[PDB]
């Protein structure tokens, strides 16, 4: 079973709008009857929570992108180390032929 993250990001993007609207109402930008006011506050707390659990569940997939980022990085370093050794051998050829 793949813990589909393309999905987790969907939600995350949703909760975010949902969180923004709900805040837009609490403030008064959007209209809402006062017997809801506190439910808005309810929703914001709950929203911000779920979001946390998401980003929370996203670290594994995050970790991998980091490894794949390190390996990439060091692999590029070593490659460079060789191409640097190579140069020297070429400069020794130049320096030898003058």
């Amino acid at each position: 079973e793949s813990t589909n993250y393309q999905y987790k990001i969907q939600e995350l993007r949703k909760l975010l709008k949902s969180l923004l609207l709900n805040y837009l109402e609490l403030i008064g930008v959007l209209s809402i009857n006062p017997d809801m006011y506190e439910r808005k506050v309810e929703n914001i707390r709950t929203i911000l929570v779920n979001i946390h659990h998401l980003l929370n569940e996203y670290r594994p997939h995050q970790s991998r992108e980091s490894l794949i980022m390190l390996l990439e990085e060091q692999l590029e370093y070593k490659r460079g180390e060789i191409r640097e050794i190579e140069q020297v051998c070429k400069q020794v050829h130049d320096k030898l032929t003058s």
Binding site: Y5, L16, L20, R64, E65, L75
Partner: protein, 119 residues
């Protein structure tokens, strides 16, 4: 250092989403449907509301930049595997090179040693 800079960036919002509800609570903001004039309040509420909209934007642009979104756990698990391998290969290449260079060096040194005057 991204999923956490996101997470990090998302605390601020939680902080400003309380740094607001505080005002609204501690200034009878509920009664808006020593006291702060109906102007100051609004200037304040807008000063925060607006600030929070900008955070919402930022948090997305970041979620978009967030790495790994599109990719699978498998598409990654191999990509790592590969890099692991292509990495060994490159070190053996590095080793070899190093050796060959040191041999070259030994050659040069030998030469230089035989040009010396004094026993």
């Amino acid at each position: 250092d991204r999923l956490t800079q996101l997470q990090i960036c998302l605390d601020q919002m939680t902080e400003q989403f309380c740094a607001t509800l505080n005002y609204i609570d501690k200034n009878h903001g509920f009664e808006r449907l020593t006291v702060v004039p109906p102007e100051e309040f609004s200037n304040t509420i807008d000063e925060l509301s607006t600030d929070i909209i900008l955070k919402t934007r930022q948090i997305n642009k970041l979620i978009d930049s967030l790495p790994g979104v599109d990719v699978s756990a498998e598409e990654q698990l191999r990509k790592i595997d590969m890099l692991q391998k292509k990495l060994v290969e490159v070190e053996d290449e590095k080793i070899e090179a190093i050796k060959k260079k040191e041999k070259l060096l030994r050659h040069v040194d030998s030469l230089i040693e035989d040009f010396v005057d004094g026993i």
